[PDB]
Paper text:
[name] (HAZV) is a member of the Bunyaviridae family of segmented negative stranded RNA viruses, and shares the same serogroup as Crimean-Congo haemorrhagic fever virus (CCHFV). The genomes of CCHFV and HAZV comprise three negative sense RNA segments, named small (S), medium (M) and large (L), which encode the [name] (N), the viral glycoproteins (Gn and Gc) and the viral RNA dependent RNA polymerase (L), respectively. As with all SNS RNA viruses, these RNA segments are encapsidated by the [name] (N) to form ribonucleoprotein (RNP) complexes. Genome encapsidation by N is required for multiple stages of the virus life cycle, including replication and transcription of the viral genome, as well as segment packaging during virus assembly.
Numbering used by the authors: 1 to 184, 197 to 485
The structure:
Amino acid sequence: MENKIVASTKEEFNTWYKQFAEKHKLNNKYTESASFCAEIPQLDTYKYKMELASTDNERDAIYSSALIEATRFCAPIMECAWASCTGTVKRGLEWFDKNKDSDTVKVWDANYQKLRTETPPAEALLAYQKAALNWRKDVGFSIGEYTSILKKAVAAEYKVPGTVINNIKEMLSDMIRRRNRIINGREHLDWCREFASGKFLNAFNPPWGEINKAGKSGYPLLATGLAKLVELEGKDVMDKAKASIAQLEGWVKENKDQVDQDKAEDLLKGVRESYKTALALAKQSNAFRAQGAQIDTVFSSYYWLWKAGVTPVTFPSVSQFLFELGKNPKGQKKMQKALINTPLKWGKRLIELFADNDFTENRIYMHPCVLTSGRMSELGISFGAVPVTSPDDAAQGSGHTKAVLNYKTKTEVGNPCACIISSLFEIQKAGYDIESMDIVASEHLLHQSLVGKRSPFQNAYLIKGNATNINII
């Protein structure tokens, strides 16, 4: 049981990877990172087999067989190997020994048993999301685009082929409808947007009346207005609002001779109260509670290993387990038996972290540290695409759902990412009742693809904008 991907620095890993890549002839023709993808799999045969299937096990077998076929050869071999390497493994686990007692980790880890049943508070999500960015900085996880924090804007348009466009619009429409269920004075929004975007002198002339006028709810209209702008455009609006209010202070002190200093101070104290009231409403809202529960794949992966008592000695058994798991068409219930039956100790402890039975609320709200049967794909993509005890076996191929994000987005090669996502959705709706399911995996794959997530190992919590507002073309 030796981890054969030996590399304790960025430079030592590159010497391993270039040696591995030129051996196996890794192909970046159809994928974003270099992979074993020599062709785009045509999955329509599974959609038609699914139409004819009668029992639930057959549909599970057809659906998993479709996912294996789709994903087995197209894993990001650079980023997978980087996550699984001896350096990243030792540093990644030991961070939790170093950081468990801090504010950003303890709020969710010490309450793990509570979060298995209950939905988390808003600050526990913010704690998690800070700790994830701390983990990436302290370990030094970024070695390029596909392992970095994304700080980009959401794109205005998303370019899909003509053969799939109709089904992509049905998925997005269902995502819009799902966004509306979790959620549940017209020029005010346009004025509040103008103010936040930089026109700070608007605050002297609020169209409703005084700057701190309360609406029907009893909350300031500037707070309500900024809070609704968070739900429509994203939490980037509150960063812009704080930048505008700073300029308002700068102008009032630059031009004290033009103003009544009492009413200027009553204005600035009023705007700061409405800003904090807008933060309180945004965190309290369901739109944030879903957004904040976004899993950082590799961070939560390493958290679950540390929670199950895994060390650098026992890591290769986990990597080897996840590799073999992604080869056979395995239903989620069969995997639970495999973790029970395996004599290794982590196998038992990892099954006890599952929260499949006892979570009554909507699963989108579940805190992203809690493991489930579906979230084993987060571990599978992290450590399972390349087995560390025998790296060459990767050429066989190990299917993981998060390997679909490695497919290209470019119309030059027919946009294989959108075609696989579209085809997988047709397979799911044919076999399973879609609106009964809380999270549909193909809709979750599309949501990441829309916001510009090109790899499972990227963090994308700090993306400016919404996937909901995008146009399909």
